[PDB]
């Protein structure tokens, strides 16, 4: 489908079945459908912990670097995954959400103790 504009984005294509999410980190034209055509599959992400309590993320780091050099963008979930991996700095919203969670749990603990 001849698209106007748009750009390559490294993003998560959601496969899996109902209640069984699974993601394919793909470099795809941003205008293409979420689970539709893609240029290259750069990795995968299993949000469900496995038998060992691990969320398996596979990153084709060489090709991710190649596409970032070619000018691909990064969806925020992929940015946060890379930050977790250490490939990028931790996302500002990762840090801020951690801080918000800390404040919320501090409130909870303080209220529980007061009670």
């Amino acid at each position: 489908k001849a698209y106007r504009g748009g750009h390559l984005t490294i993003r998560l294509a959601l496969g899996g079945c109902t209640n069984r999410p699974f993601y394919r980190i793909v470099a795809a034209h941003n205008k293409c459908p979420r689970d539709g055509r893609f240029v290259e599959q750069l990795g995968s992400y299993d949000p469900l912990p496995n038998s060992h309590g691990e969320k398996l993320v596979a990153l084709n780091l060489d090709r991710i670097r190649h596409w970032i050099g070619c000018g691909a963008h990064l969806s925020k979930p992929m940015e946060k995954l890379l930050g977790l991996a250490g490939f990028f700095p931790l996302h500002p919203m990762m840090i801020t959400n951690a801080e918000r969670l800390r404040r919320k749990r501090a409130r909870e603990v303080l209220l529980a103790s007061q009670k």
Partner: protein, 293 residues
């Protein structure tokens, strides 16, 4: 220095000890069968074909390397404590770039505590299996390697099968690989089944293990009983090479031992069953003279 398992002299000695039984090496495999093909061959053509099969058997019996147990991986890359408590599950990030040796891939783990460490050896092997699956290897360790099942396979005398499963499932430096190989070698020693590994690629490893543990008495006894006295002599020479400052080697050097003399010297020194070895050698020599004269 002391020679290693991969040195050329040791490789030659161990290959000669192993032997190249074509029937055993190319024993028919219980697998999906296709109808056979038939060729008309002269005597020269048949000799050429058997020579090619011998070369193929050498390739097939190429010994696996003996590698020291890998050291545990403990290396923390980052300590981002801000992530502490944000997630309750580990993330395992794998570099699945195609053109990278699996011992060079970066497989890191982000823990719930915010620690970005390097994946342990077990996790590394598990993830490499997950993403670059190998034929014959399973992610979850097969239960056959539990002692209760390993002893069943030993009782059936499937030591070669146990070693094959171990070599398919674990890495040569794996703790489990080394443990299972040593256990199989020990059981072969106890039950005197050293012929189960002859003409297989694991005979070299078994011999190396016995030599390094100074327990080649049983193997010498079996070889003399089976008349492979050249193999026994090479085994004793290898033992002396790997223990140059040993009582038996020094005694042989003091005397002039160049064969059955070497085996007798080993029987008299550095042998837990020296009397038995001497009896076996005496019986072999007596039979040799009997059917020679």
């Amino acid at each position: 220095k002391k020679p290693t398992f991969m040195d050329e002299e040791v490789q030659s000695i161990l290959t000669k000890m192993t032997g190249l039984n074509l029937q055993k090496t190319f024993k028919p495999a219980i697998q999906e069968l296709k109808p056979p093909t038939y060729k008309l061959m002269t005597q020269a053509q048949l000799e050429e074909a058997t020579r090619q099969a011998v070369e193929a058997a050498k390739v097939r019996l190429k010994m696996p390397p003996v590698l020291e147990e890998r050291v545990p991986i403990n290396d923390v890359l980052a300590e981002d404590k801000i992530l502490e408590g944000t997630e309750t599950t580990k993330y395992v990030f794998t570099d699945i770039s195609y053109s990278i040796p699996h011992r060079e891939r970066f497989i890191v783990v982000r823990e719930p505590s915010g620690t970005l460490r390097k994946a342990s050896w077990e996790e590394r092997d598990r993830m490499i299996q997950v993403y670059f699956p190998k034929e014959g290897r399973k992610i979850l360790t097969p239960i056959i390697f539990k002692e209760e099942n390993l002893r069943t396979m030993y009782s059936q005398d499937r030591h070669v099968d146990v070693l094959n499963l171990c070599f398919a499932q674990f890495e040569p430096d794996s703790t489990e690989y080394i443990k299972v190989h040593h256990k199989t070698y020990e059981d072969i020693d106890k039950r005197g089944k050293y012929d189960l590994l002859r003409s297989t690629r694991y005979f070299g490893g078994m011999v190396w293990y016995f030599v390094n543990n100074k327990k080649i008495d049983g193997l010498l006894i079996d070889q003399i009983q089976r008349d492979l006295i050249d193999d026994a002599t090479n085994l004793v020479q290898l033992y002396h090479v790997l223990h140059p400052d040993g009582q038996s080697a020094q005694g042989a050097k003091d005397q002039a031992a160049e064969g059955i003399n070497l085996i007798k010297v080993f029987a008299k020194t550095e042998a837990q069953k020296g009397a038995y070895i001497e009896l076996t050698l005496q019986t072999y020599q007596e039979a040799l003279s009997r059917h020679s004269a």
